[PDB]
Design a protein around this ligand. Structure first.
Ligand SMILES: [Ca+2]
Length: 223
């Protein structure tokens, strides 16, 4: 997260870190057994880390639980990033309390202009590299589909939205991928892609979660 703020420990209780020996992506806990992330985050050997603040220090609220299964969206295209969504099942159910908690799926799609909270342990610099150890947060509005398409000609599908600031300076970034965009207490987006980070006229692009609720629910019901 570039241009954000330190969230505060366990203030984003649905935020998870996906770990294979190191943090590599974010995700969102949507019930005691299941995490939503980006398909482009797929790999084998995932350990889900819940209750994290500093990902390099054991602070007392962590739950580390290995994934038993991953399910990449059936129509995920890694070239265009269309349908950049995946489900990860935990080998055992997480213990839910105020510091570790699921986030609700949307009942309807959020609109341009709605404020959301984007969070992650990704790079904090637009030029060069610095990774924070604690969770970073950014409040950002959803942008119009027109401005989104104008920013990225020929690249924005019906399964994507832009959020952030056309002026630059405030954005998600490398290492934030798969993490949440939450608006009015609902998971509305997944950190997906963008051209660098926090560049002028290159806002972040996010997976449009509301399009996937039926797939998520059905998949969970049978796995
Ligand atoms: Ca920790």
């Amino acid at each position: 997260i570039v241009g954000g703020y330190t969230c505060g420990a366990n203030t984003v209780p649905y935020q998870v870190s996906l770990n294979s020996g190191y943090h590599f992506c974010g995700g969102s806990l949507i019930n005691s057994q299941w995490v939503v992330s980006a398909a482009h985050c797929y790999k084998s050997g995932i350990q889900v880390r819940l209750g994290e603040d500093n990902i390099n220090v054991v602070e007392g609220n962590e739950q580390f639980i290995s994934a038993s299964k991953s399910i990449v969206h059936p129509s995920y295209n890694s070239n265009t990033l269309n349908n950049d969504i995946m489900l990860i099942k935990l080998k055992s159910a997480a213990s839910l309390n105020s510091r570790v908690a699921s986030i609700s799926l949307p009942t309807s799609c959020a609109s341009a202009g709605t404020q959301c909270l984007i969070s992650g342990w990704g790079n904090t610099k637009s030029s060069g590299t610095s990774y924070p150890d604690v969770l970073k947060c950014l409040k950002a509005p959803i942008l119009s589909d027109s401005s989104c398409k104008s920013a990225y000609p020929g690249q924005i599908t019906s399964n994507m939205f832009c959020a952030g600031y056309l002026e630059g300076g405030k954005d998600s970034c490398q290492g934030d991928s798969g993490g949440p965009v939450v608006c009015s207490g609902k998971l509305q987006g997944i950190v997906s892609w963008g051209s660098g980070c926090a560049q002028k006229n290159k806002p972040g692009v996010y997976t449009k979660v509301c399009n996937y609720v039926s797939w998520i629910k059905q998949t969970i019901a049978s796995n």
